[PDB]
Amino acid sequence: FIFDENVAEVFPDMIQRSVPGYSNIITAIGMLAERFVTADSNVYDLGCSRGAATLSARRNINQPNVKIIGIDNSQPMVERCRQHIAAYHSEIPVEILCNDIRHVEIKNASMVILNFTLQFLPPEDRIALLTKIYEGLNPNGVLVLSEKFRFEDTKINHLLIDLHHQFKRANGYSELEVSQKRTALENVMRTDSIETHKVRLKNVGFSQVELWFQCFNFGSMIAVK
Ligand SMILES: Nc1ncnc2c1ncn2[C@@H]1O[C@H](C[Se]CC[C@H](N)C(=O)O)[C@@H](O)[C@H]1O
Ligand SMILES: [Cl-]
Secondary structure, three states, X not given: OOOOHHHHHHHHHHHHHHOOOHHHHHHHHHXXXXXXXXXXXXXXXXXXXXXXXXXXXXXXXXOOOOEEEEEOOOHHHHHHHHHHHHOOOOOOOEEEEOOOOOOOOOOOEEEEEEEOOHHHOOHHHHHHHHHHHHHHEEEEEEEEEEEEOOOOOXXXXXXXXXXXXXXXXXXXXXXXXXXXXXXXXXXXXXXXXXXXXXXXXXHHOOOEEEEEEEEOOEEEEEEEO
């Protein structure tokens, strides 16, 4: 399982059937962009995929001189992203780059989005990235971090994983061809608890850090510089 032509194609439907609340987060990201994106700044969408978060933010930014930069290291993903974005008109320019988030520069940002992406980085690479993001954000800038969480409490972790399997079934997740390779990946994915995420965000330097959304074992938080 890699992010190839096939995963890039079925992605909106795969993530819809597997991430509870996915869609509400995307809508909320637009609300957050309205609140946090300032004029004359940049907005980064890290591991941007098809550009759902990117367009949600773009559609809700009404400030001048704002630029969006989406980054995804998969070429198949980046091609559909750029094309998907050129299909909607806007006076806000968007540059989509094909790189690995660990090497990109982040500067003059009012908003950074890591929407279910951090979990795909080696655990030992996460602090460095979040640190670079903290340094690249302007004062009062915001990091929106959505992740699949693990729960220290075993019994709760299983209860939530089960609710997550009830949701996947309800949505016919297994109908997808990518369904099993995808499910194998999540089994070996090194996810963090919500508390781990908060403590690390605070250690990097963010002043405000809080979970603002959750549905079973998936959620999203915000860290304000
Ligand atoms: N190191 C990396 N650099 C850039 N993109 C990455 C990296 N690791 C994983 N990715 C990208 O991480 C994404 C995880 Se799925 C992300 C969901 C998407 N942000 C949305 O809002 O719908 C994939 O598209 C994948 O190619
Ligand atoms: Cl994903």
